[PDB]
Amino acid sequence: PERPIWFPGSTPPPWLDGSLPGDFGFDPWGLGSDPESLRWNVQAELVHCRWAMLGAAGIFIPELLTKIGILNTPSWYTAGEQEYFTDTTTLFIVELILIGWAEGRRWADIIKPGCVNTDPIFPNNKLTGTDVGYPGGLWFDPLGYGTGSPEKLKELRTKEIKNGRLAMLAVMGAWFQAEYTGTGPIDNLFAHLADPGHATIFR
Template structure:
């Protein structure tokens, strides 16, 4: 019997046996992240997916916007793979695999041995800062030097990056569903929704 005003935390319930071992494991908040090495991999995987998603969202929105103002014609991100380019698809695939393999190999080497693939120019009598894994910095990746200095503002920028990256991942999933159900891009869908919110919305896709 609980008295009025009494409080029991989740840990109390786990200790007195109100939850089974499986539920206790799920409520611990650890799960796979309890493995330090696996957690490092998850963090890097999320960071890379977030950055790719931000590039993808930018690459979808900007060309569609340019098409709306008449700067380009016949833009469609969801059938880009069916378009004809300056070389055949096989050549593009081989070149991409080679370049991506080289980049990912260096990224993996940096995860295994942090700082081993530092590309910052070596200047006599100047010690280059050791970059964190996933944040190479230097002249090529941090020309404005935002990633240097006091750790507090740097962590603020990194937090903003991962938050925007998570939002971009969700946005890309939304763009994908929009393309499947409407055959149109996100800006076109937004304009249609603003013109007729009552009929052009997320629910209308399921009533067709």
């Protein structure tokens, strides 16, 4: 209730009550006004939090380490065009299959919780998670780290979304910067460090 709100002193929507991790009462348009869409959208925000987190790691870390002389990674922007040990198309096809397997099973768990967590081949490999979107198990919790008391996971999960939100902005940061500036993200950092009051969007 008295949890911090995005807009202090405003009245948060009723369907947001602070239970979920990262609920700062932010939903002006009420996309999660009804419970069901909220449930789906919770997943939507969750996975988007993880992909960008790798993408932020995928863009910034190599470009940083190649800006200094340690490695050779090219720009993420033209990363797709590069020619690797085979054609791009088949790798994308191979990516279509394998991801579709996890994006298939994950789909089953979403529409029907708890009906997917046992290994189809070696049935003693059952997964341990109970919350939808938190698979648990030895593959995805090699030491646990998710099986704890509340007010800790709520802290931890909020430490998972609040970072993910930080990623999704950053990668779209690297997105638009590469388009209307001619260089990588780190250059856009440095040219902003030499003359902070001059070198900005306003060139």
